[PDB]
Design a protein around this ligand. Structure first.
Ligand SMILES: [Zn+2]
Ligand SMILES: [Zn+2]
Lengths: 116, 172, 240, 179, 209, 97, 260
């Protein structure tokens, strides 16, 4: 997937990846403490190029009460069956790549985000 | 562009920029008033009092569950590795000021005055305002990260809600 | 003198009656605009439902804008030609257009049929608000009304959004006039000073002030530009 | 050309107001200040900016926006030239009270109907016999001033013609109408 | 690859043959128009192990006016030609009593090497050509008109007819790629014949500066 | 002259800019002398050939008799002489004009 | 399209879709475990650089895995070790400046700087059959008629005229540029005079207007009179052999008179 950040426990700085020459394992090392923790996921770096199309997580559920957004009745919510949804487009660097319509259910306390 | 909204000193703009790619990452720096050189942003956060990286990234990144925004702040943490204490960061600020006095404590006091009265004065100029200044500076960094991630659209110079009009009152 | 004194007999006007088409032409114009707006809605529904595939060389945005602009330009051209066919031989707009004296056919089309698409820096009207051209439209509206296609003629008059979009389009010509007068004059002055002393000498060479030969004959033929004319070579084109 | 502009007829440039009543009302309306929160609470809460100063966070921005709009539409704590902008997508409520904001009056639409009625018109027909004026129409919560940042979150009808139901409806969520 | 280097060697050799023919050296018609396959059969397919050797491709042409005026074409192996291999080439020109040579280099020449080409210019005229410049004939481009280098008698008759001085003619740099192609020095004049859409033909004369 | 034209104008565009509008001048000659185009002409073709030759001898842009000047003269009036021989062709002066 | 792939600059970043620096000390039991079978088919530093390529970008650029691998091998001089067989490369290092950070540095300076194919300065190539007959190929038929036969032409977004003209199956006769300085340094001063005439004619006559040829010819002859490109500026006009009084009347009056 993609690598997060780890934080030291004592000094609460970021943990750098360090390789030990004895066991030859991966360990995340604080570079201000003597703290070291053993790695759990051995991926140090990930760079995405084309696999970041998914804006469905970036959408929040609060946007359904935007009065300036279009509303539709043709696409019902798959979660709660509500007839009415707010649709809009991608608002990002990859907005030039599509008019993929993202739909948000307008029912209060549902907030289901879907596409097509 | 920060103005005190009642006292109306000369409006002290602060820039928080990212360097272009053309270095092992893309790096966030600050352009403070009365500091003729740039400062990397994590040194400014350590000069404001927060020494740990978790505290600084709590002031910048509000949800730790998106690591894409973590990947962009790591170089700024990397070149502020050598700076781990508040007075060390304040010396870093003061050694780039308008007239850096050779006394170390003079540099410390000058940097404290710059980051209190001349950096983000609309947030506050009194004492005990470093948490609010850090929260707003982290907000500026967070907005810069969002615009660089494509997650927020860039601002328009000529959008007219971004403008204000000086009538006879403010001019006089 | 002769033509101006005959115009006292004949006369020449332009009225509000010359800008008016018959009801058949108005119905044809409205049908063309309606069908074109429906084509733009169909292209929008194709782009929403991922059916729109890009043409080679362009992404989905230049191809969507190209398709919508092609539909709307074909609308404006077709309905302008429909307006111009309605014009009688008594029409005064047509009198000044087909004589070349003043105005063109796009002026007749805009006055009678449709003003057309308003353009700011080449594209359609930009999303100056957050994803809206004006706060009277919904967000992410790419239809013709939303992005500056004026649906009415100057005779019928513009809707308030069309009025503002037309003012945005017309501001471009004013800005372009000012900046082009600023820059072209400097270009002209630099052109003059680089060649002000170049002249045809009495040995028919073209020299500068240094007496350096620029051309051995003026224009490579030795002729002046006033007396020459467009002619056709007879033997170049036909087959053996 | 384009660098020298003129006001439209109903355009009003705001004079400025002290943000202190806004701040006191926000403090007494379940807003958590910045200095007394854990930073973990910011992620799913609405940041509140007053005159460009981040002053705290709120957990319920929808009812807060309704409350601020009510208070401005009856002018209790919030004067009529204060602009409340809720940017929903990025979870920020921006309140501006400072001078120089250019704002225009718009009629208020609630549930596809104008709040301007025939009683308002019949009572404005008698401005000298009645002492009913524009300020009583602002205080009625019927018209309100919308600056340019707030205009970017409103949905305007050009005319009340836009509010009657069409066979295919463009927008049923108009919030304001052009005068 | 060894297909994209046999092609390069054949192309630069064909351009060298055309350059030598345009400069008046006796190049036969068969080697002006040799097919790549004839180049394969004459030299070989694998320049990596060296079936065509770069020192095997050396050309010796002689002028049409006199066989004494001979001109080498040298293809050094090293990408950056230094002083020592220029001295090897100059020693070969000493022993063969030959005044002119082209050094078709691959990547370039060191600044002292270009300086050394300049210094020898009284005794031996040595010319640098990158092999990038000889992958095409620039004189066969449609923008490049026909250049004819005139003899001194033709230049004298030119300046006598138009009552001219050399500094009053138009100029062409000695480092102009057509000027480098024709191997012309400062003080020579090229006759440039170009078609004209107003006149049909126009002959321009350019003094080399 | 045709092959030279093919070299000069390789796109096949015949529209040139030249001094004397020869076709209009032939039309002027037809109207001045009331040339009936339904009758046989009294113009010998060799008169046309010699007249075009001696006309080309006096359309002089470069003045001189040495080979440099006469070559520059042949160059400076190349298209006009090609056009003049094409237009005042002995066949066109008898069949057409 | 073969030529268009030979011309357009394609770095590694153009074809990659994903990259990651895992830690794997034993390739015999790799960590990602979907690369395990073909690494065992294939069978060091523990730091593994893994890139993942896009299928489509490999296809329409006509590239293959061994091509990219040999590009990296030739570029880096076997300082690394590329293993290929999903399109996955597994770059390692054989035999202070630690190899994880150095591997990130190699990844960053390999994504944007290494050239898989194409000329470095050409950003984008467009191929299109022309409509205007100035770019249609014109021949002379067996009848002697002019026939405009329509052929594919490429138009780039950047100039390297030396490298383009040198290519196989590129016309070295008709291929041109709109960069005036590029034509001057590649082809010469008479060629840049003709190219300058063509470019000025295109600018003038795109509007539909017409300027007589002798005025264009005089401007181009003035710009290219002295063997180099004389700009219509103070840097070309005020550097001539004209007098100080002529130069000071144009621009830089006091500087010209001081120098005189
Ligand atoms: Zn630690
Ligand atoms: Zn739902």
């Amino acid at each position: 997937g993609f690598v997060g950040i780890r934080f030291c426990q004592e000094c609460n700085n970021m943990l750098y990846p360090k390789e030990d020459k004895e066991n030859r394992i991966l360990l995340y090392a604080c570079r201000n403490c003597d703290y070291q923790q053993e790695a759990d996921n051995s991926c140090i770096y990930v760079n995405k190029i084309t696999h970041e199309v998914d804006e469905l997580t970036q959408i929040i559920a609060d946007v359904s009460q935007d009065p300036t957004l279009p509303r539709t009745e043709d696409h019902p919510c798959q979660k709660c069956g509500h007839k009415e949804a707010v649709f809009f487009q991608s608002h990002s660097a990859r907005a030039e790549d599509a008019m993929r319509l993202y739909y948000v259910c307008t029912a209060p306390h549902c907030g289901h985000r879907w596409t097509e | 562009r920060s103005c005190l909204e009642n006292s109306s000193r000369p409006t002290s703009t602060i820039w928080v920029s990212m360097l272009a790619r053309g270095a092992i990452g893309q790096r966030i720096v600050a352009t403070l008033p009365y500091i003729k050189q740039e400062v990397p942003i994590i040194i400014v956060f350590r000069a404001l009092g927060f020494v740990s990286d978790r505290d600084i990234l709590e002031h910048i990144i509000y949800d730790f569950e998106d690591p894409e925004m973590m990947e962009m702040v790591k170089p700024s943490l990397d070149e502020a590795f050598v700076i781990q204490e508040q007075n060390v960061a304040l010396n870093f600020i003061g050694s780039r000021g308008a007239k850096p006095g050779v006394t170390k404590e003079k540099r410390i006091k000058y940097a404290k005055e710059v980051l209190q009265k001349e950096m983000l004065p609309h947030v506050g100029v009194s004492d005990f305002c470093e948490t609010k200044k850090a929260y707003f500076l982290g907000y500026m960094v967070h907005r810069l990260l969002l615009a660089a991630l494509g997650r927020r659209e860039l601002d328009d110079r000529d959008h007219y809600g971004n403008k204000r009009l000086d009538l006879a009152g403010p001019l006089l | 003198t002769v033509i101006n004194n005959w115009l006292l007999i004949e006369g020449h006007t332009i009225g509000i009656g010359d800008s008016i088409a018959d009801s058949k032409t108005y119905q044809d114009i409205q049908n063309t605009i309606k069908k074109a707006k429906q084509d733009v809605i169909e292209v929008i529904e194709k782009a929403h439902n991922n059916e729109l595939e890009p043409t080679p060389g362009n992404t989905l945005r230049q191809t969507f804008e190209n398709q919508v602009n092609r539909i709307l330009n074909d609308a404006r051209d077709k309905t302008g030609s429909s307006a111009q066919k309605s014009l009688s031989e008594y029409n005064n707009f047509k009198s000044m257009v087909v004589s070349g004296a003043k105005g063109s056919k796009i002026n007749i089309s805009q006055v009678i049929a449709v003003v057309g698409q308003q353009n700011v820096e080449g594209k359609r009207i930009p999303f100056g608000f957050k994803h809206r051209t004006l706060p009277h439209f919904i967000k992410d509206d790419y239809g013709p009304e939303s992005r500056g296609f004026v649906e009415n003629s100057y005779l019928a008059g513009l809707t308030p959004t069309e009025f503002f979009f037309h003012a945005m389009g017309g501001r471009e010509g004013l800005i372009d006039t000012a900046v082009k007068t600023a820059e072209t004059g400097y270009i002209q002055r630099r052109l003059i000073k680089s060649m002000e002393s170049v002249m045809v000498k009495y040995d028919a060479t073209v020299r500068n002030s240094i007496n350096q030969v620029v051309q051995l004959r003026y224009g490579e033929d030795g002729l002046a530009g006033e007396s020459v004319e467009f002619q056709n070579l007879a033997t170049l084109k036909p087959s053996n | 050309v384009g660098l020298v502009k003129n006001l439209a007829l109903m355009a009003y440039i705001s004079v400025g107001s002290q943000p202190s009543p806004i701040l006191e009302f926000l403090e007494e309306w379940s807003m958590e200040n910045l200095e007394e929160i854990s930073p973990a609470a910011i992620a799913d809460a609405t940041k509140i900016f007053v005159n460009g100063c981040w002053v705290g966070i709120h957990k319920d921005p929808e009812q807060l926006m309704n409350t601020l709009r009510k208070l401005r539409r009856q002018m209790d704590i919030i004067v009529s030239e204060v602009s409340m902008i809720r940017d929903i997508r990025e979870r920020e409520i921006r309140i501006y009270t400072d001078a120089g904001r250019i704002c225009r009056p718009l009629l208020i639409v609630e549930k596809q109907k104008l709040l301007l009625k025939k009683r308002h018109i019949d009572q404005l027909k008698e401005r000298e016999y009645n002492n009913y004026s524009w300020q009583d129409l602002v205080a009625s919560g019927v018209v309100e001033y919308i600056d340019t940042l707030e205009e970017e979150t409103v949905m305007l009808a050009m005319t009340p013609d836009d509010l009657q139901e069409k066979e295919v409806a463009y927008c049923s969520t108009y919030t304001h109408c052009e005068i | 690859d060894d297909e994209e280097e046999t092609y390069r060697l054949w192309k630069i050799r064909k351009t060298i043959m055309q350059l030598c023919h345009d400069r008046g050296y006796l190049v036969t018609q068969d080697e002006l128009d040799q097919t790549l396959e004839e180049f394969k059969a004459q030299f070989g397919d694998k320049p990596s192990e060296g079936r065509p050797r770069r020192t095997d491709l050396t050309v010796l042409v002689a002028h049409n006016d006199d066989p004494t005026d001979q001109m080498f074409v040298f293809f050094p192996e090293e990408p950056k030609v230094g002083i020592k291999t220029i001295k090897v080439y100059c020693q070969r020109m000493q022993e063969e009593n030959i005044t002119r040579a082209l050094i078709v280099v691959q990547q370039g020449m060191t600044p002292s090497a270009k300086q050394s080409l300049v210094d020898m210019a009284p005794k031996y005229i040595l010319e640098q050509f990158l092999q990038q410049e000889l992958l095409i004939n620039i004189t066969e481009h449609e923008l490049v008109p026909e250049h004819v280098v005139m003899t001194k008698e033709e230049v004298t008759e030119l300046l006598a007819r138009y009552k001219l001085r050399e500094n009053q003619l138009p100029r062409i740099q000695a480092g102009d790629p057509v000027a480098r192609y024709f191997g012309i020095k400062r003080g020579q004049v090229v006759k440039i014949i170009r078609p004209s859409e107003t006149a049909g033909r126009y002959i321009t004369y350019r003094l080399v500066q | 002259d045709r092959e030279v034209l093919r070299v000069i104008f390789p796109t096949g565009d015949s529209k040139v800019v030249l001094p004397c509008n020869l076709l209009r001048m032939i039309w002027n000659a037809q109207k001045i002398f009331h040339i009936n185009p339904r009758l046989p002409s009294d113009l010998h073709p060799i008169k046309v050939v010699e007249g075009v030759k001696e006309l080309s001898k006096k359309l002089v842009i470069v003045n001189g008799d040495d080979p440099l000047s006469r070559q520059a003269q042949e160059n400076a009036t190349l298209l006009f002489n090609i056009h003049l021989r094409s237009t005042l062709c002995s066949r066109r002066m008898a069949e057409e004009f | 399209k073969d030529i268009l792939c030979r011309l357009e600059h394609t770095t590694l970043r153009k074809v990659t879709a994903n990259t990651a620096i895992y830690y794997d000390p034993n390739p015999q039991s790799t960590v990602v475990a979907e690369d395990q079978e073909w690494v065992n088919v294939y069978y060091i530093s523990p730091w593994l650089l893994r890139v993942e390529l896009d299928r489509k970008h490999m296809t329409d650029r006509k590239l293959t895995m061994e091509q990219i691998a040999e590009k990296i091998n030739a570029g880096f001089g076997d300082d690394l070790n590329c293993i290929f067989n999903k399109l996955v490369l597994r770059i390692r290092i054989m035999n202070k400046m630690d190899d994880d950070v150095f591997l990130r540095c190699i990844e960053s300076n390999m994504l944007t700087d290494m050239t898989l194919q194409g000329i470095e300065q050409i950003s984008k190539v467009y191929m299109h059959l022309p409509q205007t007959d100035n770019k249609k190929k014109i021949i002379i038929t067996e009848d002697g008629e002019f026939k405009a036969l329509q052929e594919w032409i490429l138009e780039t977004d950047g100039v390297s005229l030396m490298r383009v003209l040198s290519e196989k199956d590129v016309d070295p006769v008709r291929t041109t540029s709109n960069d005036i300085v590029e034509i001057f340094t590649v082809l010469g001063i008479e060629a840049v005079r003709k190219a300058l005439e063509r470019e000025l004619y295109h600018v003038i006559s795109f509007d539909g207007s017409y300027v007589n040829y002798r005025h264009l010819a005089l401007l181009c002859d003035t710009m290219t009179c002295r063997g180099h490109l004389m700009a219509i500026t103070r840097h070309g006009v005020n550097r001539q052999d004209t007098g100080p009084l002529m130069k000071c009347s144009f621009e830089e009056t006091v500087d010209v008179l001081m120098e005189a």
